[PDB]
Design a protein around this ligand. Sequence first.
Ligand SMILES: [Zn+2]
Ligand SMILES: [Zn+2]
Ligand SMILES: [Zn+2]
Ligand SMILES: [Zn+2]
Ligand SMILES: [Zn+2]
Lengths: 51, 1130, 137, 117, 116, 151, 64
Amino acid sequence: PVPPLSVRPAVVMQGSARNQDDLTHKLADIVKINNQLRRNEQNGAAAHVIA
Amino acid sequence: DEITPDLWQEACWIVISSYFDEKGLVRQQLDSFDEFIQMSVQRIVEDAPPIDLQAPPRYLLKFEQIYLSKPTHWERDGAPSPMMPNEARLRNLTYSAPLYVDITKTVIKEGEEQLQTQHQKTFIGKIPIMLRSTYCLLNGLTDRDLCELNECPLDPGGYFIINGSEKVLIAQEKMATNTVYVFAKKDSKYAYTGECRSCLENSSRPTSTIWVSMLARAIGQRIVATLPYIKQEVPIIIVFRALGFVSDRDILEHIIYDFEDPEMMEMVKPSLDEAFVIQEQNVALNFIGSRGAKPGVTKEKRIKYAKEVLQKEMLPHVGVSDFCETKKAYFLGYMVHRLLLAALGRRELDDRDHYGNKRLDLAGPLLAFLFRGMFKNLLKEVRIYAQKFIDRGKDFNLELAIKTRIISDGLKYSLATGNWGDQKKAHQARAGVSQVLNRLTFASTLSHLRRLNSPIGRDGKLAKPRQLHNTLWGMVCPAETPEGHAVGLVKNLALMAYISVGSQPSPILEFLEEWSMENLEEISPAAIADATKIFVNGCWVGIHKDPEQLMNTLRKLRRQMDIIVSEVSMIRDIREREIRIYTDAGRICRPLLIVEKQKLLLKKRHIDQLKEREYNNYSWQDLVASGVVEYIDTLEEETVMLAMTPDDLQEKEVAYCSTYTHCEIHPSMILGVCASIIPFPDHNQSPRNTYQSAMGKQAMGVYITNFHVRMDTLAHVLYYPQKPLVTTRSMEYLRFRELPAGINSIVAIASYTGYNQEDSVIMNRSAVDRGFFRSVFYRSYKEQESKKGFDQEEVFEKPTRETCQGMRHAIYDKLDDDGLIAPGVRVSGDDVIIGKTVTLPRYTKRDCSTFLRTSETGIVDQVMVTLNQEGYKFCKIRVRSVRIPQIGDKFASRHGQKGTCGIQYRQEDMPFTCEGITPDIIINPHAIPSRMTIGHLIECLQGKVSANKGEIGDATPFNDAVNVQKISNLLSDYGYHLRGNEVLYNGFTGRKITSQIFIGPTYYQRLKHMVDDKIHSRARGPIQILNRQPMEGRSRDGGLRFGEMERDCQIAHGAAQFLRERLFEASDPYQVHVCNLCGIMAIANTRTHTYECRGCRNKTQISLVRMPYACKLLFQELMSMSIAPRMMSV
Amino acid sequence: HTTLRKVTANTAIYYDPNPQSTVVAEDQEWVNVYYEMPDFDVARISPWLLRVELDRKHMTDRKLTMEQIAEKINAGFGDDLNCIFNDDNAEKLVLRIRIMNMDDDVFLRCIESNMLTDMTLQGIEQISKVYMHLPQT
Amino acid sequence: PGFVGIRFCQECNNMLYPKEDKENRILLYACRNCDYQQEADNSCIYVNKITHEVDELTQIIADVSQDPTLPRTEDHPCQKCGHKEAVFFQSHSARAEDAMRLYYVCTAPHCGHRWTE
Amino acid sequence: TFAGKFEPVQHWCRAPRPDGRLCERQDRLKCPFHGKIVPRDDEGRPLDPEDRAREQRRQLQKQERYPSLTNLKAQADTARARIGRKVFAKAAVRRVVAAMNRMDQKKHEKFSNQFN
Amino acid sequence: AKQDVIEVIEKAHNNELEPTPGNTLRQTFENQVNRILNDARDKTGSSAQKSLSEYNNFKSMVVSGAKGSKINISQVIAVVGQQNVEGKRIPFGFKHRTLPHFIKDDYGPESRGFVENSYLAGLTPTEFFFHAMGGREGLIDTAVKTAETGY
Amino acid sequence: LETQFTCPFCNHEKSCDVKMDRARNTGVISCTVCLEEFQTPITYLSEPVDVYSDWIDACEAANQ
RNA sequence: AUCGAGAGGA
Ligand SMILES: [Zn+2]
Ligand SMILES: [Zn+2]
Ligand SMILES: [Zn+2]
Ligand SMILES: [Zn+2]
Ligand SMILES: [Zn+2]
């Protein structure tokens, strides 16, 4: 479960740079490795690489 | 010849004056930084190994010599100019000098085709410079020259300017190195464990710690050594075997110096039995090699690993060269020997809190730790950059290889933030080093520059490191310590305390081999029995046969300023036959007068030469060179017999000691900077002295003479500072007379109308009208317009209603065309002082103006415009606000008697004496008895005498020529009641008060804590983004926290609706829509009135639920964790 | 609680091949008093002797006679560990426990340790100290 | 009784451990490392002084008389040499923590006699 | 320091030995050889007739009361093996170390005036 | 009080002092000295109390119960008394010494932290340091008990 | 100190198990994969790292 | 604005 935006607000900063919340960054990490792992398990990948 | 008692009391102070004419108060900071720049940087650069890189051609890249120029600033054009510290403060620059290193890179390919190319002065980095240090532009300048650069002559220096911010390095306590310490942990598997943090004197490496423990209770004691880089413990006898001492006799020769002792022998025996299996060096080296390098390693390599650990990693201070194992064996056997004495109780466990056992890590050694790490990282980058070019075979330019940002930005970052370590390791780094210099008042600045810190951790609730240890005497102020969560962990130097800067032991060692000393590899162990060991910086270097005349010779060398420098400690433990000589840095010591048979070496000839100190250039340092004064460290005080005063040397009816060796210059030098302000501190309860030592740092005054040019964020200046009428002789060196932080007030201690009860004061409104304790508050606002990119640029310019989007309704008419308010303009709360507009991606520019901090109401003192380091416009605006004392402002005497102003009465309303003197302040008598601040009363009486006599009173702590009787007799000579009482008349009715009131001059302080900076109120202001609750702080217009204990109190009251109001209605009221079936928050569309749960696929059973927003947030964060908090409404 | 260590003055291990001719000179009386009468065979006895010197006053303080101590030793270890002892009249309160049926010089030490620490002559274990007094309140 | 010291082999210089010879029924001191043997002259293998009746005079050394921080007295002359002054101090060690007993040392150089009242 | 101490033993065991002599052992309560000491006259008869009858009854009761291969049970059953099984018991050693730890705690306590 | 403490110190030095039940000889000597010096402090306090008039304002605030106690009056007028660290006299933080101004093994009242002066008389430098040690104990207690009581 | 070791013969990680028969003062290291076995004397101070050490040494010595 | 740090107040 991805939480909504209010649990992880993207606070705006003195300029226009929108700083994201720690949860958003972490979901970025989970998403990237999930997508990358998905393409490996879908394809041929070493069992230790999949592990 | 002899100084008689009648002259002593100024002979001594003359001596003290000379000390402070030579050293000052921040001498430790400047000496540490000077040693770091003169030595430590060069040592670190040379101690780095040459980086040999080859694919073929090879390059070594020696670094051989350093050059630190003066601090200069390069503009955008790049012309170097000398940058002055005030320019750095104003422009937010870093007061740093460039470090250049000579590099030698020799090409060696084949056929003796060798050629060296030397790059002289290769810019390696930028070193921030401590002010008034030897390499500072303010060095050696006269008071003229400093003023003529806009510098205060009274400014002590001792701090850095990083990005315009004044940063002070706090000395860090640490537990001394290369010394064996035996402790016993009550709750552990060891009865006894000895340790040595060995560290080679030249800082080639960090300290490596060796532990030699004692296994807990055949079942006999077993001794193991925890060597560095070895995974598992090792029995000590196998370590000894690994050093080539195979026979059990040879091992015990090193461990036990006297074989006749049965009891040592039997104790050691279990370890011999435990290592009986391994009988020869190669197996021992095997055994050690197995633990460590890899599970599978060839035997030859395992042996090489064990060797390498033993000669390098184990006990580096003993030696790192080859063929030292006799030295290593003796020192290791000495550690075991110490463990045995502790285990047998012949010798006491070492004390962790003894400052003889502790070292203070000052600015120099701390910057050396940083420089070591940063120069290592820099060399690594040079290697990598060169390596890729050599891999492709092309030549590499060294200037391109050296990215100087590592040294520069590392030092700048660590001094700017205080996180002491690499920027990446921001959590392993230890903060609190390098704090922002306190510039509230001059005393706060001095104390902050003399601040020490014990990094035990404030969370720790063990009182032992917080206790005032006996050994702090003369080294650390007994009184000055924060009374909060760090009590006794943050300390302050005593006035004459000097932290040793460090020195080379080679002259001493060379001399020792002249004299009757014998090396350790050169003796037979049988000689160690009645001989005396000699340690130098922890390192057992040899033995001696007559320690007494050795100590006489060494002492009398050091007193001559011969090969032994003054800061070298030389302790003879007599009962145990050690002579421990220390030259390292961080040893806190203090000066003391040497004593002959029963006689000071300080004669009247020395006092005479000191009196004309400004003519014949006879200084302190000649006093030291004459063998009359000596610096004694904490560890050497254990062997010293101190006379408190020369009266102790005097032959008495029953002699106490009759064999003194040293004398105090004056006992009042046990106090620090802030405690040396207290008059008669020996007539107060000690907590009161501590509270004053804290509150003198919040007292207003003139924090520095050049305050007109400083753009400090906050500054308080008292209109009419006065020097105290009653003073101590130490303040002459704290420069309190020259930058005082209070006013002499006519204090009456009386109960008058009840408005001074419970630590409160009644002030004279008329005196306040005449400028009494009036101050000016300066507040500086920064701003800079950033052109970071063409996407968006800021600019200072008077905004307009037609182009700017985020324009508040406040008027911008006070700004000029340039967007900056002008000096002399009166500005109220929420007003604009800088009009800054940022271009958008109410069109094409948005308002980002700087407002005043709300509810201030000052006048713009001045406006400075310049360019910052990168070089855009940068503005500083100082606003000025006159603070007239009022009800709620905090005031304090010098005795811990603090209190807010309860009310102000006019002169006709205040009580008056027969001669119409009204008190400036009335304090309640109930503040005296429990507090036992008799120093307050004695100061009031002495001040009455001083004001009537035209003096300044002498309130120096331990002065038998001043007591209450003699002051009272003096006061009775001026037509006053001898005890300081007077008949007062009621101001309201004019009737005499039946009690005669105690009234007189007392030095009071106006503290930074004014009520107008504390008053705050809220009614539906801004809220926090994450949880829709009131903000935090006055500055944020925040709400006050109704915490758990207030909830608990209101539960006990039974006030359920008030509790709901505070915790629901007045904080974060909210509504959610909940599916009645699954109890999960549904989707509501109130505009179209459609309400549905995607889970249950229903749109008819939805309920409204009134809950706090924080609770909705909690339930959502619980679903984020796959928890289903289902709000069932049935 | 009183262990044998609390009342013991000093322990030692000797190599006494003969009980008849003991290593120590002052213990020759009662030993030969013990041995001529064959209650306990000389052949069974081991060469290795355990001699413990009790101090008088600690024995008196707990009102403890060597009889009680020897009974406790012979109860904890049965007949496997012979103990003998003199009367409570000699200037030195001594008793000899040489074993009678890892070498015996090592074994007897393990025995000695275990006796001194965790053999309970009197009292209740894990009651270390007791103070008697009159309450004024 | 007195303590027993460790004795070392004369071939490998390792400690000699006890053992018993049944066919002379005599104590021997033999090395586990080599195969050296000795006949004991002690007959005692282990000694534990639980009481710890240690004469702390043996632990004192005459050099302590040079300590400026120790108290001196003229009231206890030396029985060795007749020197008039003497330093005194307490036991200050484990198992001497009980009993504040004073030990005296003669301050005459090269006499260094030590005693107790 | 109440700790009252005395060493009177006037009574002797006086029990008849097989060699014809009376026991001369000054045990307080028990002779190890003849059990409880009872008062006896110059020829060793207990003075109390009931004690004499009890002693006589006790004496009467006391008077009333592949082979060629090596036996492994011999090693298991002997005095030395029994003492070894007891002393080297997991429970037994723990108590030893616990008491020795108190002994070490005393060593730690015996520097009182200092900070440690 | 000092001259009695000297009496006790010689008895202990000459082994003329025997322990009381339930205490070691060190602890009995310490008891016996502390109870000499507390008798001294109480007696001097009594003297100061009886010296007060009913015009005295210290007394006025102590009878009313408004502020202060009789022990405060004793410390201001008579004697500040024994400074304790961790419930014991000042510890030997040097080698067998409380300060480098004393001889080794000095269990006298001065050496171990008895302030024989009042706050009006003023403390001597050693008394000042020992009093600062005791007050530091109070400050540490106040600053360390709060977390653990609040929990 | 790891107890499972890479076999010098088949290079299979953590495939070697070590058995310390203290009663006979012998350590036996056996690879589960290639079934290579080695026996060395051990002492009470010995560890599986020491047995694997003796095995590597025996291999290198025998391979000379 | 957020985070962290530090210094302070009761
Ligand atoms: Zn639903
Ligand atoms: Zn041998
Ligand atoms: Zn003599
Ligand atoms: Zn009998
Ligand atoms: Zn294999």
